[PDB]
């Protein structure tokens, strides 16, 4: 539900990123990460929680690189 919308938003983030639309990609990454953090906050299972952290960390790493690039300008 919340993970379905996170997937939708993150697919757009990756698409915008591949098109070099950096400010737009960054917002979609932030928004998708927010939703994934909301799913994580509501999850009790340790494997699911740990796997969700890996997914979030991977998207966070990409968005931190985009922000660093935009900040240089």
């Amino acid at each position: 539900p919340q993970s379905t919308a996170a997937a939708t938003v993150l697919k757009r983030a990756v698409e915008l990123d591949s098109e070099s639309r950096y400010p737009q990609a960054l917002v979609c990454y932030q928004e998708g990460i927010d939703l994934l953090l909301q799913v994580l906050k509501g999850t009790k299972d340790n494997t699911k929680r740990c796997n969700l952290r890996e997914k979030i960390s991977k998207y966070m790493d990409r968005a931190e690189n985009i922000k660093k690039y935009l900040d240089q300008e």
Binding site: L26, Y29, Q30, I33, D34, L37, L40, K41, R49, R53, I56, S57, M60, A63, E64, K67
Partner: peptide, 14 residues
């Protein structure tokens, strides 16, 4: 864990 990632998200939005 959630706090570290939420801090990373807030810094991203600064």
């Amino acid at each position: 864990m959630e706090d570290q990632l939420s801090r990373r998200l807030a810094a991203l939005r600064n």
